[PDB]
């Protein structure tokens, strides 16, 4: 059955962008999906997106750009202490320049650089390069 809607959203985005599409429709929406897409958006990876409100779990239409190579979820949400970030990025990001581990921390949804800056850890959600 349909568990981990963030996984399905990221798989849909990756599959649509590898086929060279301009927009992608993902359902169902979630607040974790919206914060993940905002984290991508502030780094200039997925353009800008819009939430469609039906009285169910909504849908999202995302305007793809082309700078993304792969976005992915890390399931299950492993506990990531503030040291483990270097280990985790050396397992996940193919280089030191571009790529992002997204963490759900007590300060909210962020990427690993802003996780280091606020001096906190959390649970790992995904990565995009």
């Amino acid at each position: 059955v349909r568990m981990n809607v963030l996984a399905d959203a990221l798989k849909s985005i990756n599959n649509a962008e590898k086929r060279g599409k301009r927009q992608v429709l993902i359902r169902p929406c979630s607040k974790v999906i919206v914060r993940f897409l905002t984290v991508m958006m502030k780094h200039g990876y997925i353009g800008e997106f819009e939430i469609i409100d039906d009285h169910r779990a909504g849908k999202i239409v995302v305007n793809l750009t082309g700078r993304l190579n792969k976005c992915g979820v890390i399931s299950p949400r492993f506990d990531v202490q503030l040291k483990d970030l270097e280990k985790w990025q050396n397992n996940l990001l193919p280089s030191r320049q571009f790529g992002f581990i997204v963490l759900t921390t007590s300060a909210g949804i962020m990427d690993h650089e802003e996780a280091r800056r606020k001096h906190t850890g959390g649970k790992i959600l995904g990565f995009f390069f």
């Binding site: 190579n69 193919p94 280089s95 320049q97 571009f98």
Partner: peptide, 30 residues
């Protein structure tokens, strides 16, 4: 046709060349 290990080396090298390609394109933007 040709060995798998040589194909894997070629795929790794072209992906690495794409990695510095994206890095140089990002560096030119500043």
């Amino acid at each position: 046709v040709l060995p798998k290990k040589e194909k894997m080396k070629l795929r790794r090298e072209q992906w690495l060349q794409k990695i510095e390609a994206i890095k140089l394109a990002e560096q030119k933007h500043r």
